[PDB]
């Protein structure tokens, strides 16, 4: 689980690095990158989905 944990946080914090450097005036931006990717019916886009 230790190796699976570092693999997940390293994947997330790397991508949030190059997501923070996009202008709001765009299709896939800071606020609306979760909605277009998700093709299901979750209650709220939070927790494990993001």
């Amino acid at each position: 689980l230790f190796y699976h944990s570092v693999a997940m946080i390293e994947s997330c914090y790397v991508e949030l690095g190059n997501v923070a450097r996009v202008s709001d005036s765009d299709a896939i931006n800071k606020y609306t990158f979760t909605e277009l990717s998700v093709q299901g019916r979750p209650v709220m886009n939070r927790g494990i989905i993001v």
Binding site: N18, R21, V22, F33, S37, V38, G40, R41, I49
Partner: peptide, 22 residues
């Protein structure tokens, strides 16, 4: 089928390089 299929976005680099584009 109620299965959470998450699709990816490939980052694309252009002239400025300071700002990112998906």
């Amino acid at each position: 089928d109620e299965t959470l299929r998450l699709k990816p976005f490939k980052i694309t680099e252009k002239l400025d390089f300071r700002v990112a584009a998906y």
